[PDB]
Amino acid sequence: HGTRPDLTDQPIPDADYTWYTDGSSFLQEGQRRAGAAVTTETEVIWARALPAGTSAQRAELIALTQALKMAEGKKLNVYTDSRYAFATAHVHGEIYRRRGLLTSEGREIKNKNEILALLKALFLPKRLSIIHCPGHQKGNSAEARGNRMADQAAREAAMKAVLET
């Protein structure tokens, strides 16, 4: 009946998982390729190539949603460099849903199905923080490294799918 009341935008100290997500989308070999990833600072938890023509923004929602599903029952800090996915998760998604805009034939809202899946996935972690950090950071901080890891993994997945066919 609504969205997740305890969803926070700052890291929680006691988290089981601190994960970084990224979606990427680019033209490779005459086609729009996309990838989505979930990583720690140092290791890839999950990464996938997504369907041809997937946008960066859709990929970012898909990565975030996957982090939520994987962290079911656990305390999760997840980072995203997408203002779009951050805002969708925290604010826009639930408004669009309550207005009936997600299940409508209106194509005025992009990524309707991913947003609905994200909204459902928000309830899975025991505790949840979805944190925005600027991407493509030159910083040496953990978050800068986690985001570069996630960007790398997402891009690697999309590219690997291309050359594996």
UniProtKB/Swiss-Prot annotation:
<feature type="binding site">
    <location>
        <position position="151"/>
    </location>
    <ligand>
        <name>Mg(2+) 2</name>
    </ligand>
</feature>
<protein>
    <recommendedName>
        <fullName>Reverse transcriptase/ribonuclease H p80</fullName>
    </recommendedName>
</protein>
<feature type="binding site">
    <location>
        <position position="107"/>
    </location>
    <ligand>
        <name>RNA</name>
    </ligand>
</feature>
<feature type="binding site">
    <location>
        <position position="25"/>
    </location>
    <ligand>
        <name>RNA</name>
    </ligand>
</feature>
<feature type="binding site">
    <location>
        <position position="27"/>
    </location>
    <ligand>
        <name>RNA</name>
    </ligand>
</feature>
<feature type="binding site">
    <location>
        <position position="22"/>
    </location>
    <ligand>
        <name>Mg(2+) 2</name>
    </ligand>
</feature>
<feature type="binding site">
    <location>
        <position position="81"/>
    </location>
    <ligand>
        <name>Mg(2+) 3</name>
    </ligand>
</feature>
<feature type="binding site">
    <location>
        <position position="55"/>
    </location>
    <ligand>
        <name>DNA</name>
    </ligand>
</feature>
<feature type="binding site">
    <location>
        <position position="28"/>
    </location>
    <ligand>
        <name>DNA</name>
    </ligand>
</feature>
<feature type="binding site">
    <location>
        <position position="60"/>
    </location>
    <ligand>
        <name>Mg(2+) 3</name>
    </ligand>
</feature>
<feature type="binding site">
    <location>
        <position position="57"/>
    </location>
    <ligand>
        <name>DNA</name>
    </ligand>
</feature>
<feature type="binding site">
    <location>
        <position position="22"/>
    </location>
    <ligand>
        <name>Mg(2+) 3</name>
    </ligand>
</feature>
<feature type="binding site">
    <location>
        <position position="83"/>
    </location>
    <ligand>
        <name>RNA</name>
    </ligand>
</feature>
<feature type="domain" description="RNase H type-1">
    <location>
        <begin position="13"/>
        <end position="159"/>
    </location>
</feature>
<comment type="function">
    <text>RT is a multifunctional enzyme that converts the viral dimeric RNA genome into dsDNA in the cytoplasm, shortly after virus entry into the cell. This enzyme displays a DNA polymerase activity that can copy either DNA or RNA templates, and a ribonuclease H (RNase H) activity that cleaves the RNA strand of RNA-DNA heteroduplexes in a partially processive 3' to 5' endonucleasic mode. Conversion of viral genomic RNA into dsDNA requires many steps. A tRNA binds to the primer-binding site (PBS) situated at the 5' end of the viral RNA.</text>
</comment>
<comment type="subunit">
    <text>The reverse transcriptase is a monomer (Potential). Interacts (via RNase domains) with host release factor ETF1; this interaction is essential for translational readthrough of amber codon between viral gag and pol genes, as well as for viral replication.</text>
</comment>
